[model samples]
Target: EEFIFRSKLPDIYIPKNLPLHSYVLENLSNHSSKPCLINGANGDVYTYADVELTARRVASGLNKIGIQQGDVIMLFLPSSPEFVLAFLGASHRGAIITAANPFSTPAELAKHAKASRAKLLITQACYYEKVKDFARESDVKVMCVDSAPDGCLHFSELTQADENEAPQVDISPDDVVALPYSSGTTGLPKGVMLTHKGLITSVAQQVDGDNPNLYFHSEDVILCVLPMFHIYALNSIMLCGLRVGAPILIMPKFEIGSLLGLIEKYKVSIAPVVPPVMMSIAKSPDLDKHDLSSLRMIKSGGAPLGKELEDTVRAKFPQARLGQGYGMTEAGPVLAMCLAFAKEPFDIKPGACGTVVRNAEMKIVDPETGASLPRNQPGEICIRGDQIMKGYLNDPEATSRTIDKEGWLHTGDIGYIDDDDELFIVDRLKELIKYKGFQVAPAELEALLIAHPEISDAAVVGLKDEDAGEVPVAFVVKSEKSQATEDEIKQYISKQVIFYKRIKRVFFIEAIPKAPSGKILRKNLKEK
Candidate 1:
């Protein structure tokens, strides 16, 4: 029997039948004239009306070339307003948008692009060369947000298509509209099929109705520093803000000086950030130089914050409400948000992942036997909800391993619900390391490490880090007569992964230990 836990908040009705864009824009009458997207890099802004029209135009434009319902479109660009237009525009046309990190290696990106069976790729000219080979190999149409070169089409061309001319096609709420990849329990990565109904329900749970768990007022300027390619920023910051008509200040990249300056300049109200970003603010000696009094709240997620670090952030923003959210890409990206962030605040304890979201059921289960545990017991956290993903794309085996026959999505996360019904994560059952909130697949890194010519054998694991939460470290065996220094191996992996997935430390050993089944003894190395 499962000892399930649920939200203390009253159950609210979620209209799961509406399209994602329509549900997000349902309150357009109240806030349509308000500013929606503000580009921090160039100081450009787009009102709600402007963004809506552009999205419709983009839908019209994307349709003219051949993108149809259920087709996958790749968005490979830095965090920008154009990404929003392209994403919403694609959603408007009933096409699924799959976002990829702009910094990933060409080979790494190819896996996602190819997996989605993408029909069109929207990217910037600066980053196109890395994927030019992929484009040619896959026969995917390329559209550049910048100037078009030769056969490439420019983003501006999409606006030329008349929005009025766009066809009205009936879209099912169950249709998959987004395909975001996450490091599965054991593997490189796999695409997660998030439906329109799932995403809408996830957002509605947070920002909809009076006494919302996480509220966003019209004047709230939410910070969008984290890359939208990830589900945390995409759902919590972008989609949530759009649903509530909060203006989003989009920063293409995170720079301490620029981010702080933008906060003061725009008087940003609600900031959705990761632990690393919060640490940057906590440690910045010049933090007093900026006018951050306007900030009303800061929600931290993507990684857990230690009590010490959370206290430091509290001191930094004493006037603002600070809370943590727990999310995963496979869980429609958000499972719980800090209730202290609500328009009407609650007694939120520090270092907690907050209450289970409304309309969701959570259980603590034995990691080995799969029996549900009682309250205040630490076990593998399992959640069952419509917000949980449909399943992994093209891999039923992995899907079965994740979502059981009972429809419970085993999070592979070790946590416990206290007597107060609040969830507190203790550790991870999966081997994935979260560096500053980005998942670094140990198997993926080990495979890459083994591929190096000089490396005879390798095993990758994470070191519990106060700063990054978990930093990837490698234990390797060098080839005979092959002199590969730690720096050399580090640089080898650095060239392939995004900033967070880079190896922080490397240790060379005589031989790598493994189980009789050929599984790398990661637990042994993690003890080191």
Candidate 2:
């Protein structure tokens, strides 16, 4: 016996054959002169027409530099107008865009560059040092958004190219467009292949239809504080905003004071944030000082929003509706979106992660017996739809393991639906840690730890944190007769990985509990 779940809203038509860029800007004629992207730092604006023209020029620029259809381009940038330009331009050129955090270490960047086989690396001059060595060694071309270094190319090359000269590419709906990395159920990060059709379906699920699931309109000023490299912002914020012809307020970094001021200054109507950002807002003393009355919706995702925190945020913004969206990088990034944010709103529970998105079928299966549980019974969440990822790049085994033969993609999350069709997440079945909504793979950190001479056997697990949601903590079995201080171990890891992936605490243990199959017993470690 099996139980399936669907959205309370009816499924509408989605143009599955259109290219992602064309589909997102399909209705551009309606609001071509409207503000599309606003730089919160300098107050610069790029109208819809400007964005479309610039993106075409960028495609021409990419073609001039020998970029062919299906070539891979890596974006090592923070949240900026250039980021959006490069993304759309690459899409227009029929090239795949794989973006990463600018804070990634040289080794981390190299790993991604080699794995993705990226032909071009687009970044800023400040982070040139991180990818310089890799670029030279791999013979990959490097382009800078701000200013090019000695041998690197400038962003003007992409922006100033003749739009008429852009190559005419025949794009298929199945062609991969965005390659975002995620450590699925258990392992190092692997690229999730989101095709143009998949992304269009995803964006349409949120913003399209007569009554949108996550209602955002052209008049809405959307806040994009979450990093575009992450799927939540990339799909729900950037892509969805573009689809609706809304003005997106881009913030490169998050600061409580600046964020509040920008919301008041821009009259940002829709805010998509993580639990950490929600926590910051709830605790910020500046709430009373800013005029946030313009806000209509505050959508939370990336991590669960606790009932207490939800209540607190609701109290602070009494006029705004606050809710959470459940997503993962592989499930077309959105499994469920808060129905309260829909045009025709539904009654929502405080802590639920909303119902499943329209046109997708979700089911909860028991971890041990693989039985699909009915309402009110907790199990692993699974989804099946055209919106899901094509597969993991170059990893058929991993893809097969994740997306079963029946086409259901296992979410590796423990959750269940209520009688009212709203979803709730109670636990995680995966090994990845959510630090401030950014993924921190335990296996990636553990591999780094074992490389050190002072460390023999190591295991990493997440510990609960007040601000970061969860922080990585290591349990190490030191090499006999070798002395390694906790700070030394931490410093060693911090230098090799990004900031969030840094080990918060290190415990020297006699031996790490493991299974016969060589898998680390993470639950046992957490219990100890």
Candidate 3:
């Protein structure tokens, strides 16, 4: 059952001091006057020159607020021009941006911000109230934009300083620039630390490789519906847009009518989306009304995408290419993207995430033993490249467990490559529930549910769904004579989490199916 992968990809370089903030500044020379970013919901645009100047101003603003390099900031804004400016801008000042989901509960945000030791939080008016009370006691200070409902400092007030007065902090490629979280194979969520070189290399893997996977024509306007907190969105949609001088039409949130309207209005060529978003485009009856002939391709990721959904999309958008991407939070997130219909000429197979995402090296390794397998073998997918994260922030034990001394990022995803080099993601080795394209860690929900008075033991798992991708469902063991029914427990947890994390179904378990060592056997539970 072992095969040798025909060696074709080159060796990868791993850096120690890489940071992403520096790349934004370095690329500003020739592209200063070109279109860099655009707001989708509203027709606002920022030139590459404006992006640099504003980021520098943000650096100055951070300094004025007594923010120091190496200090952490919770970058909790939607997919607006401000999110891009704040994150890259903060990194320019040597501050690490710890990104969080805007829809996340205060408890979820609190866990990450505290773990990363953030000293400042940058968000917008929408999420200010949710995180405000949490920030009151933490060492972090809150700075917001668009409209802070309560008494809070506005970002515009801070970023409006004279361009000449901005702080110019030097940053290297290997230094931690942004911290994006992903639940590893087990236990609680772990922070996936990405550096400048790591991110830039990732972008290069798609945009600059020998056979570049993504196309960025100057006239192309991309859809930025994907959230900036996720690595797939951050690297591919935001940073890659900046790199290629393509104007991005940013939508704060996805609305079917409005999203389609923007595509028609902007003539959006590239729509980097998750499965749920793709589903809307595929199934929406309203899609027939729009001039979606303008779209060139739709890239889907974040959760496992089935071929059936992709086929449905292909039938809908006969002119545009449909690509299915394979990624993981730990593997610089994107291991490969399918190039069968890519702008670039390359031999690509169906159902692949794309061939090692050019420039990065991929290896299929046997999980039980430290041995490398070849093509057509099902094994743990591992990656070695500049795109792989620096390490798990503030948790060396988890870092060591995921990545070894050999400098390879061990992606706990179970998949195999075909003879044509196309990979198929059959199942995830990691226990994280990918609900509606966001990572829902079972341990996090377990910690919350166990705190309930009526619950004695609880086990969490995801159920199958065609529309939402996956929904978190819990199996509970209540205390003897306790009165909390499934509805009460569901409502209780629902209040504690965002809409996506709500348990859609609950089953009362006399006892959770577990191993002798007390490890929950989720596979057996899934069968029963």
Candidate 4:
């Protein structure tokens, strides 16, 4: 059956004609005095008016440095109030913002800096040594935040740009504002072009209207522990929070102790986390020691989590509404969000990735034939929406392969929708194990394996076999460096499935490889 699934909620209007920054800050008047950003490191805070003024100042600064419309500005820093200031400031001046993960090695950063070809680079003094190599590639100028080195400008200079002087440029709604790179699911990372209108629409779908899908209020305190470079943190946590005038508790890095402390300190109401963090929390004895009762909702993304872990998380924070979302960078990063995050929460099943966000159309199609599938049938999930990205930077061929002529963006993920309009992910198309004629989703087995008390983190892949065309194998990371044998792990999995889906072999490893966006680097394990 050919099926096209829409959001179970009524559709809402997404403003198509506004700059991303203007749109996100449109509601500034309602909560002008509210705290906009709370630095988790120190007690530093930026109010809405303070951030808005800072953004204007930063815009003027970029203009003083010769930044013009459509120019790329690379921000290499940890998550801080300054990062958000520079980000919006660049947008205000009509320059595209491309943020890099500061945790990345110097070699990796140099490659990104060279590829970005940014006219201006804003970073910390600590990172200046690593990125100094990029200046040789181009006429790029560096501005350090803490202290300016020789021949480098100070970041404060941009902030000191006359507050009255704002850049005057004609920025169209479709003009690209942010240029974040993909997680490199298939190959080397490519730049995703996110426009002002696309981002505004994405934010509106989540936080706009009377009964918003993913609700946030001005009084809400959101956790910003995830790196801002990834779309999940950028779009969902920061941008959406800006739109709703919510106060953000920004963390520089993810440390379990610090995260728990911030939650209790700020009384953080909204928490966005990935599965790994949730896993650690689920097994931690200290989780009970902290008062995380202030959390109203917890949203999980970056990867689909098993139901067992979700249940464990639900138990950890019984008061917080727990749900997961599925997103890709190219699709303006959000295809589906947890409906349970709505102002009027909906009942969602365990491990459900939520319904399609409003103003978006989703279809599940046969991977081989590209034909749409009915409810409960697994297939390649495709989505179409204004929030979808323009195309990859300077790569038409790659863009064409991803977004088709009809505008449907192929997610390269295997999933299905149930009768109740809930979305569930099975696995990636390439990760499926083919045994005889039956197909096995590695995620299914991995999910089951993770449910075992002894098992901590698990990943499953297919290996060639003589009898069965391919057999499923696993690489596991023990929870506490505890001993769990291969047969014990194999024995744990066989009881839950038919013979074909049973894991053939198991190998214990120190840790599973993951990309910056928290996606498991399965290809690396496949190479092993």
Candidate 5:
């Protein structure tokens, strides 16, 4: 017997057969002349008509430069209009787009580029040196958005191509389009294959209904300060904003002063952000300085937002409807969204991740027995719908382990549905730690720590922080006669990994608790 939870709202029609770009731009004629992408950095704006035409030109350019349908093009850039243009353009050409953090180290970037078998990589001029060696070694074409370096192609190569010359791609619903890497439940990061149908269904679920779960019309200016490399911004901010013909204010990076200024300057209405950004806004002394009355909704996701923080942010943004959304990269990124954001809004409880999205089935299953649990009984959360990802790229075993035979995608999160159908996440069953909305794999850090000669054995776990949702901390059993200080160990790891993945604390121990099968006893360590 099973108890399945559904959305309070009725299900609506989803255009399952449409390509991602077409689906998002379906109603473009209604607002083609309106501002679509606003570059908050330099006050540059691209209209909907300009975006669509440029995307077609980019597709033609991709084909002209030897990129074929299904070829992987890696985007190693920050949040900008160019990122959006390239993504939509890639979709038009039926080419797969795998985006990564531009700030990533050469080794890290190389790993991602190699893993995706990237035929082309697009990045800004500043980060060209990071990928220059790898591009030459792998024979991958490099294109720069700002200015072309020695052997790199300028972005104009893509934007200047004749739109009519674009290759005609016969795209299918199941063909993979976006490949965002995620370390699901446990282990190192792997490519999560997001198909055209899956992405369309996800966007439609949030913005397509008569009374959408997330309401953003052409009049609303959506603030997109979050990194587009992450699925939260890609699907929810960029894709959803495009689908509803809303203007997306693109900030290349996050700075409290600049962010507030942009919101005031652009009259940003819908602000989709994570806990860290919320914390920054709540803590900033300049909130009273800016006129943010135009803000209608402020959405927080990527990590659980405490009730106190929620209340604090709500007080700061007095007119905005503040709420949280629950998502996993594998759950097409959004499993639940704030219904208070709907056109016909519903009263919501504090700290709830809202009800599950309409047209999807969510159930809580006991992790020990694999049996579904009833309302209010906390268990592993599972969701099933067309909105979920196809699978982990090239790893069928990992796919089967994540998405079961019954079609449910186990979220590795422990939560419960209340009487009002609101979902509250109590804890996580996954080993991946989220630091400031970025995924930090414990295994990846553990492997790096153990590689050092002074470190005998190590276990990594998340330590809760007020600023960052969680920070990676390590427990280590140092090698005999080793006198490596904690600072030294931290610096060693920091030099290798990205900023968020760096270890915050190091606990010297005699031994690392492990199971009979050599598995890390993380809960025991967490209890310590």
Candidate 6:
């Protein structure tokens, strides 16, 4: 068994007070003729020059429409080149951009829009109703990618404006760029404010420097099947790709056949993927049918990947590099990025996420005492870095709770560093089920059950009990319910957890409500 120590990699840059658009503009200017973005599904491509011109047109058009600094503009679309144009274009002109899921319900959009105080919105025609339903109540102008209702403006009109027109606004790195909703640790989803400086530092920490491995060159084709609305896709797929002048292949949704076909057709070398996508590629029986060896690497983030799943990829890819990234919406969505292709690549730790990213300091602290613990001790992982979010939007109280007076951002996750410096997340601190002195995490129990073929999704929660304090209970949803009995599921968790932490009860639910960000909403399962 090998271990990855916490020492900094040979090449990593931690920038200060840099904006995302400015950094991308530098790359576009240098790599003028390179393909910047490509819609592999349709073979539509945009060069670096094209991206610069399109973004300038978008900024100029927004300024012409009276959009000003510190104002909010909503970008509610899928993974298309237009998503990048609107996000960077608005930020470049000093307008804050708020990204939301295209799959969100109207009610969800209303909550996010009100919290962000967005005055203008950009989205596709299909999801226009979601934002429009609330636009009538709020003072927001709805803009659509295609023909919309009589009141809404068309998105295409922005790029058609004169690209030579300069936006008349002063922008700063401290200004917010994107307001993304994240339900970190606990509570309902709330807006997490991100500034241009934070986004730029994260991008530089991962991709910029003498010997960059996180993001490769423009010649490397990157496939982006993940939803653009999420932070993982937003940063790794769109932002990082733009930073390095790499051409991005966008897709609105994930269809295995389409994804594989695109990979084979475009010779995609880099892929930023999620656990579910990893599972599909690793477990799919038809993997041999495609010529996927063109891939140099596949980076998985947005969730934990078990050792069993990681091994599946090793068996399939054989030669292509593979590693996992540890991130959250608050930490610029990247706390640690493992590059398996580096010249001095860190040894792969099976099931381990990675070492802390450059310029970020991490410590595991006792939940009650707030005392930092040594290696291998299970405790709350606290992170302090420039990549951390500015704070929660409009809710200073919530911001103060998660991030204290100190620079440390208290991540509710429970994990610790190994002797080699690799961080492995065992469970979440907030989701702990109390049995007197003993604590239990539902994710721990759920992960055990999810390994079974009979189960699809499972959740663990604490139920009230008079004698034993709070007791651990599990709610499961299975593809075939009859395959696994309640007794079997209970035994599975019981055998894994300590006697005090063993599940006291097990039941089935129709679905486990997860937020748009791919996190399980445990609050929705708590007993009333």
TM-score of each: 0.96, 0.98, 0.94, 0.82, 0.98, 0.81
Which lDDT tens digits does candidate 4 get at residues 131-230? 6766655678988889887688898888778878887877899899989876323444678899988888888878887788888754579999887877
Q: Mark the regions of model 6 whose C-alpha exceeds 4 Å error after superposition.
A: 1-7, 10-13, 213-218, 431-528
Measured over all alpha carbons after superposition, the RMSD of each candidate to the real structure, in angstroms, is 1.7, 1.1, 2.5, 10.5, 1.1, 10.0
Candidate 2: misplaced stretches above 4 Å?
A: none
Clash tally for model 6: 1
Lowest-scoring 10 consecutive residues by lDDT in candidate 1? 158-167
lDDT of 1 at 220: 76
Query: How far does residue 450 in candidate 6 sit from its true spot (Å)?
Result: 29
TM-score preference between candidates 3 and 4, better one: 3
Query: How many backbone collisions does model 4 have?
Result: 0
Candidate 5's clash total is 0
Model 6 scores a TM of 0.81
- Taking the tens digit of each residue's C-alpha lDDT, what string does model 2 give over 1-528? 368888888998999789999999998999999999999988889999999999999999999999999999999999989999999999999999998999999999999999999999999899999988888888999999887887999999999999999999999999999999999998999999999999999888888888989776556899999998787788899999998889999999889999999999999999889888888888998888999888989999988878788888898888788888899999998999888888888989988898899988999999999989999999999999989999999999999999998999999999999999999999999998999989999999999999999888999999999778899999999999988899999999998998889999999999999899998899999997
Give me the overall lDDT of model 4.
0.82
Clash statistics: count for each candidate: 0, 0, 16, 0, 0, 1
Per-residue CA lDDT of model 3 for 313-430, tens digit only, reads 8888887877777777777777877665345545654566666666666778888886888777788887777778888877899999888887778778888877677777776777
Q: Order of candidates by lDDT, top first? A: 5, 2, 1, 4, 3, 6
Clashing pairs in 2: none
Tens-place lDDT digits, model 5, residues 411-521: 999999999999999989989898888889998899899999999899999998877878899999999999999999999999988888999999999999999999899
Model 4, position 125: C-alpha lDDT score: 88
Q: Write the per-residue lDDT of candidate 6 for residues 1-528, one digit (tens) a residue.
A: 012224366535555556678776675767888887787667778888988888878888888787787888888888888888888788778888887767665755776788888888888888887666688777688999877875898887677778788576666777888787776666546788888888887787787776554747546888888877767678867888888777788877778888888888888888877766777776677777889878988788766656776787877887678888788788887877785544457676787777787766788888998888888988888887787899998788889988878777888888888887788888766765545423344665677777878888888788866444478888888776457778888786665444665777778877888899977777788743
Model 3 Cα shift for residue 259 (angstroms):
1.6
